């Protein structure tokens, strides 16, 4: 029963438990293999195991489509270290190694247990007879499409090859398809489901974005007496959440231009919150000096361009403030997400300026136009401006800020728990909104 899983998890992979109970629930669903499954867990989640373990409990070959050789390699390497009969069929194989493998697959009782294949190979007619014989002998236990988001023009790593894969699924109707990716907008999931011809009901195992310990809020630069002062106070309030330790933790501030970054470090530091600028303009030595100071807490605050920040990630990041709105909602989630990794309360804040919104809007439009002449028209062109608009929405709506994020990325209603401005004081937000309507 569930008995076998526990065993194979320890005896093979050397694991006492699954990383999360979603990893478990996903894995166990693949194992039943009565329905196709989609796993959208972030990088380092234990996705691989959700098909690697089921592949071995099953009495057949699991084919795993994966979009470049670097990726395949890392896994097939580790899978071998675990003494697992894994084989990549790639174009980095000597024609002799190629042949020896295809020969394996053509035998009854083939050595190979997991087969790592490029989408490229899985399409080529060089592999088709082999593939057919495998299906015909009912030898195919599972079809895994890693990096499934690469079927989607709304996902920004689209691979024309991936479109073949749908046709493939329908041929081996006998066996379950497991689709995996780290991130999917709802539109990408809908594409992934359709273009891979995943059999409804599709079991989904999507890691919620929502993190309790972060407190999101929005302020409007148009309605602020002393911008730089507000910031000072926000930074401070967030720091010294351990008054016994005095000023504990660290924090980040985000800016569009480099001049803004330099200046803001200055203005914050003079106002008494010691801060350094981080941007692509500086030398490599300056970058590592500023980043090193920040890492060791010699400086509590760093000011990074939205173009370039986070040389390395840190745990006690008590606050991430955006002076300027970001390119995309994805971007603000990414950026604000460097906050609070250690799990102790943190504060994320967006400073919203209609003048910012417009200044970015024109730059999006302009380098949308620049690409339409460079290569031409596309579905992704709409998505760029969409991505940004979801963040404008974030600011301009009164409504739970975590639930606004949850909807964008496709998670169900998160339990905010007085956990954002609007959840704590819905009116204050109402009143502040009405205010920017006058100064619009």
């Amino acid at each position: 029963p569930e008995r076998r899983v526990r065993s194979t998890l320890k005896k093979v992979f050397g694991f006492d438990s699954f990383k999360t109970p979603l990893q478990e629930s996903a894995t166990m669903a693949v194992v039943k293999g009565n329905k196709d499954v989609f796993v959208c867990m972030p990088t380092g989640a234990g996705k691989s195991l959700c098909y690697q373990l089921p592949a071995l409990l099953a009495k057949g070959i699991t084919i795993v489509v994966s979009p470049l050789i670097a990726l395949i390699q890392d896994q097939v390497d580790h899978l071998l270290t675990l003494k697992v009969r894994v084989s990549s069929l790639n174009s980095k194989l000597s024609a002799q190694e190629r042949k020896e493998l295809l020969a394996d697959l053509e035998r009854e009782k083939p050595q190979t247990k997991i087969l790592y294949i490029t989408p490229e190979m899985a399409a080529s007619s060089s592999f088709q007879p082999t593939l057919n014989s495998l299906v015909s002998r009912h030898l195919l236990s599972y079809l895994v499409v890693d990096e499934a988001h690469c079927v989607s023009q709304w996902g920004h790593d689209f691979r024309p090859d991936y479109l073949r894969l749908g046709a493939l699924r329908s041929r081996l109707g006998h066996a379950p398809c497991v689709a995996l990716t780290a991130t999917a907008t709802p539109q990408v999931q809908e594409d992934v489901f359709a273009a891979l011809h995943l059999k409804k009901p599709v079991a989904i195992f999507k890691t919620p974005c929502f993190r309790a310990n972060l407190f999101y809020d929005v302020q409007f630069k148009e309605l602020i007496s002393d911008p730089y002062g507000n910031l000072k106070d926000f930074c401070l309030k967030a720091l010294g959440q351990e008054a016994d330790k005095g000023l504990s933790g660290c924090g980040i501030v985000y800016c569009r231009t480099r001049e803004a970054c330099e200046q803001l470090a200055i203005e914050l530091s003079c106002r008494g919150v010691n801060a350094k600028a981080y941007h692509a303009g500086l030398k490599a030595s300056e970058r590592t000096l500023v980043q090193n100071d920040w890492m060791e807490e010699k400086v509590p605050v760093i000011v990074a361009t939205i173009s370039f920040g986070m040389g390395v990630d840190k745990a006690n990041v008590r606050f991430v403030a955006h002076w300027n709105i970001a390119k995309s909602m994805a971007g603000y989630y990414q950026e604000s997400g460097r906050a609070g990794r250690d799990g102790k309360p943190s504060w994320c804040r967006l400073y919203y300026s209609r003048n910012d919104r417009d200044q970015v809007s024109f730059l999006i439009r302009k380098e949308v136009a620049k690409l339409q002449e460079k290569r031409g028209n596309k579905a992704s062109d709409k998505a760029t401006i969409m991505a940004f608009d979801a963040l404008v929405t974030f600011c301009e709506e009164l409504g739970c800020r975590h639930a606004a994020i949850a909807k964008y990325f496709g998670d169900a209603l998160p339990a905010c728990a007085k956990g954002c401005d609007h959840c704590q004081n819905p009116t204050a937000v109402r009143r502040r909104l009405e205010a920017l309507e006058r100064s619009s």
Partner: nanobody
Amino acid sequence: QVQLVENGGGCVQATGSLRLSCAASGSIFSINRMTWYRQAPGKEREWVAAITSGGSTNYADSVKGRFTISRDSAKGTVYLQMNSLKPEDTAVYYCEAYGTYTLAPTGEGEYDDYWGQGTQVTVS
């Protein structure tokens, strides 16, 4: 699982009106295509009207002008306002929830098609 429960039907005089609801229960996040099928006794199921996420609506030529479907986005529920009713429009009315994305705050979800129970509609 998900429950599709239709309501708002009954017996009415011709040139009457009704309004049918489809209460879609469960942790529904999105319905790709919510469609109104009607089963008139003695005929083949008829496609009536349908609505995509984003509210793109289309209507059978047999009902255009007279019928309108809508989503109370908040309620998570679709309506078929049927005016200028005719004995022809007598049927059982039911939705298909095509591409019904469900998701718990756990992270545990499903993607599936769901068919509603139906509401009886006679027209004198």
